């Protein structure tokens, strides 16, 4: 039996339903990485934004740890959106086998059906990762995230201003409207530094929506180790949603 990575259906099904919106909107700029951890990472790449969804160990089962990491594009030659297909309510078994170093053999089952598909592997795919520490790090209650979404929602940029002492975070719109959160029971400020970044409103809003699916707190960090990036993430017991946005001039 070749190294096999299987999905534990109960939690995996719960997970994709919460991510339905995200999964359904995936296009051609997304990769799926299967790791022997076990782990499943979906990474969507845009010019100034990288979105990543990581399913944790509780959603997977791995037999043999010699399973070589496998990466494929989500846009499959005849089936189209791969992850969307795994969201089918009929799915009863889903597993990936490491037969060749060149492809991933994916098997799926449903009541009186079974299917197998071999997808060529992508080599050297770069996966964006959250930095150890950073210039700014704030945690926000889900309710704060909801406030931000409500305030922004139905091009342009949004300025994110962070203040030292007392700690504070402000979101500024081009029209001179500002939403601020001071240190209190709804937001925890770990690392703070006086700085202001500018990000694309659309990607920022989209990032907040992606994180909101957890209905749990979010983390916002501004990293300056290299080029300035804004990091917005949230997680639950099944997956973690992470987004990295670059600055707009």
């Amino acid at each position: 039996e070749p190294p096999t990575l299987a999905l534990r259906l109960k939690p995996y099904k719960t997970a994709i339903q919460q991510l339905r919106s995200v999964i359904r909107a995936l296009k051609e700029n997304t990769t799926v990485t299967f790791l022997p951890t076990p782990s499943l990472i979906l990474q969507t790449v845009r010019s100034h934004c990288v979105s990543k969804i990581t399913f944790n160990s509780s959603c997977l089962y791995i037999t043999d740890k010699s399973f070589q990491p496998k990466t494929i594009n989500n846009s499959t030659p005849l089936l189209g959106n791969f992850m969307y297909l795994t969201s089918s309510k009929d799915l009863t078994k889903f597993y990936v086998q490491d037969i060749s170093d060149l492809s991933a053999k994916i098997s799926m089952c449903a009541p009186d059906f079974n299917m197998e598909f071999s997808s060529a592997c992508v080599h050297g795919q770069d996966i964006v990762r959250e930095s150890e520490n950073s210039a700014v790090h704030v945690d926000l209650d889900f309710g704060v995230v909801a406030d931000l979404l409500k305030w922004i929602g139905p091009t342009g940029t949004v300025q994110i201003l962070v203040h030292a002492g007392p700690p504070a975070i402000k979101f500024i719109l081009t029209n001179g409207s500002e939403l601020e959160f001071t240190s209190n029971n709804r937001v925890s400020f770990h690392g703070v530094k006086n700085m202001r970044i500018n990000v694309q409103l659309k990607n920022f809003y989209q990032t907040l929506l992606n994180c909101a699916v957890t209905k749990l707190p979010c983390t916002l960090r501004i990293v300056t180790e290299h080029d300035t990036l804004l990091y917005v993430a949230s997680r639950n017991g099944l997956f973690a949603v992470e987004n990295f946005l670059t600055e707009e001039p």
Partner: peptide, 20 residues
């Protein structure tokens, strides 16, 4: 290497094989 990242993201990335 399928999806290329803009230069700004490269230093914050690692190869899928050295991932967790």
């Amino acid at each position: 290497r399928r999806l290329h990242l803009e230069p700004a993201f490269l230093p914050y990335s690692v190869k899928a094989h050295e991932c967790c």
